Design a protein around this nucleic acid. Sequence first.
RNA 1: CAAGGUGCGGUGCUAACAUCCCUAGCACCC
Length: 123
Amino acid sequence: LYRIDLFITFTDELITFDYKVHGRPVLTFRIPGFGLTPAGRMLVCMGEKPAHSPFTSSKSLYHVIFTSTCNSFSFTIYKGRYRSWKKPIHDELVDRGYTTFREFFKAVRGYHADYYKQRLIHD
RNA sequence: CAAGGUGCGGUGCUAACAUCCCUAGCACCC
């Protein structure tokens, strides 16, 4: 049983992706921000490419949880942080599995591959 | 029934003991 937590922070200026293993930082990247609806933010969390909206001047956080066994792969998105009491805004379970962390991690990063290409780095 | 988050620069002392991770107070150093 492998698990990765990804926290996505949306502002109009930047969208930040923070990946964690055992809750500690392993990978981060950020891209230029754009205007989004609530629906649009969920689609970004999903790794889709939504239509842009007017700016909102808002800051919001979304919590994406990836887990896998040799039998199944789970993908869950929360508005804000996971809580015992909170319903996910999107939840997917698929009959694919992984038996090494490196391959699991490669699958996880595949969700946002196209956003990774847009990342901003130092020179 | 919606309702925790600066997700973290070191060090020392005292107190306490959130099913990803994260105890509090004071002080010194950076």
